[PDB]
Amino acid sequence: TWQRPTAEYVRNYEQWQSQRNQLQGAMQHFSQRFLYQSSGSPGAYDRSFRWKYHQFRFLCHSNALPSHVKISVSRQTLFEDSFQQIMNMKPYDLRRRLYIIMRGEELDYGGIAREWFFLLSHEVLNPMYCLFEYAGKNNYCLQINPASSINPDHLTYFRFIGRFIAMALYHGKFIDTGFTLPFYKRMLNKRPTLKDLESIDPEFYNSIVWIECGLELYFIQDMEKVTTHELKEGGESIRVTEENKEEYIMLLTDWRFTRGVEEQTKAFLDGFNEVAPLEWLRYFDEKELELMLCGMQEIDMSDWQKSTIYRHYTKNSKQIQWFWQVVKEMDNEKRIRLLQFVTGTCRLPVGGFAELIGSNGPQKFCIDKVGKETWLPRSHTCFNRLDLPPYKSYEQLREKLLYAIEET
Ligand code: NA
């Protein structure tokens, strides 16, 4: 199906199948995700996630056509069945209440849509289709495959994936595809930063940082057969001057997050926007959007504490005592946000904090002493690591930690 089989296609195929067995189990765990209880108005603006969710919800109700639509599918042909129906419906009818009819299976229509959204959100990752790939080891750091074109229907598929994610959000259902924060940034129209490069391509991040005694470069980029690309008009001709670089770094970073995925992302965003206008997400930051789409979980504090590792610090060290106390003080939603800051996602694997994964593989939540008291804490999400300055007080740590976290 589409791409010929590489050695690495075979590898990714098996991971996906295993994922399907695992997913079959995993639903019980997925069903205890939650957001907020219904309300229509959300009351007076208060900067909180709660208010934003309600306001959004409200927009979805208010603009909903009445009655329902039947989406008819077979369990073994979920992707293909869903695609046809959805694509042949007219986006506004997807705003009506969803009745998902699983063929041959007979009360809990909410329960069925929930499972359908979950299943389908894994089925789209199928290495056949060639839509996505992973940057790190195993299934670390999802991204659109630059070579999605190998599948000649790929843009239509991306458009459908767009409607599907808009429907999850529009009907308040959770998906589990694994999109990254920079991908959400793009749905919000925020420009991903250099910091964000570290999340997805840490070594590329290092090179950009290093970028005066340094070799020959051109406002051009080589992307892979091969084809080089302009990076602004007639860039081949335009020498990057080892002291004239911002244009290069900026455009580079921007290009790293748009290399060979421009039409695919456009197509994804038109699909989303037909169903639920992107304008409606205006209040959300990229972590809040992830939350809307994936759902909150209860963060088990003790699981967190147990499976944390330290560097130049023990559990006894004063700064870490202060850390855990502050975390305890936090409500669940602030615990999630700290989780997103340090690991780049609000999703926790099946068993909990021992299984945590980084770029390199198994990689538990880490805290090292590294800062400058005047510096705020910082993270390296590829390594699930918090750099926590050896602060000189509880209130020093608490202010800074809270600040870095709600920062955007
Ligand atoms: Na991570």
From Swiss-Prot:
Position of the signal peptide: none
Localization (cell): Nucleus
Tissues in which the protein is found: Detected in heart, throughout the brain, placenta, lung, liver, muscle, kidney and pancreas. Also detected in spleen and peripheral blood leukocytes.
Residue ranges occupied by any HECT domain in the UniProt entry: 90-408
Residues at the catalytic site: C382 (glycyl thioester intermediate)
PTM info: Autoubiquitinated. Ubiquitinated by the SCF(FBXL15) complex, leading to its degradation by the proteasome.
Its job: E3 ubiquitin-protein ligase which accepts ubiquitin from an E2 ubiquitin-conjugating enzyme in the form of a thioester and then directly transfers the ubiquitin to targeted substrates. Polyubiquitinates POU5F1 by 'Lys-63'-linked conjugation and promotes it to proteasomal degradation; in embryonic stem cells (ESCs) the ubiquitination is proposed to regulate POU5F1 protein level. Ubiquitinates EGR2 and promotes it to proteasomal degradation; in T-cells the ubiquitination inhibits activation-induced cell death.
Domain notes: The C2 domain is involved in autoinhibition of the catalytic activity by interacting with the HECT domain. The WW domains mediate interaction with PPxY motif-containing proteins.
Record note on quaternary structure: Interacts with POU5F1, RBP1, EGR2 and SLC11A2. Interacts with SCNN1A, SCNN1B, SCNN1G, WBP1, WBP2 and ATN1. Interacts with ERBB4, NDFIP1 and NDFIP2. Interacts with ARRDC4. Interacts (via WW domains) with ARRDC1 (via PPxY motifs); ubiquitinates ARRDC1. Interacts (via WW domains) with ARRDC2 and ARRDC3. (Microbial infection) Interacts with adenovirus type 2 PIII.
Anything else known: A cysteine residue is required for ubiquitin-thioester formation.
Name of the molecule in the record: NEDD4-like E3 ubiquitin-protein ligase WWP2
The organism of origin for this protein: Homo sapiens (Human)
Gene that produces this protein: WWP2
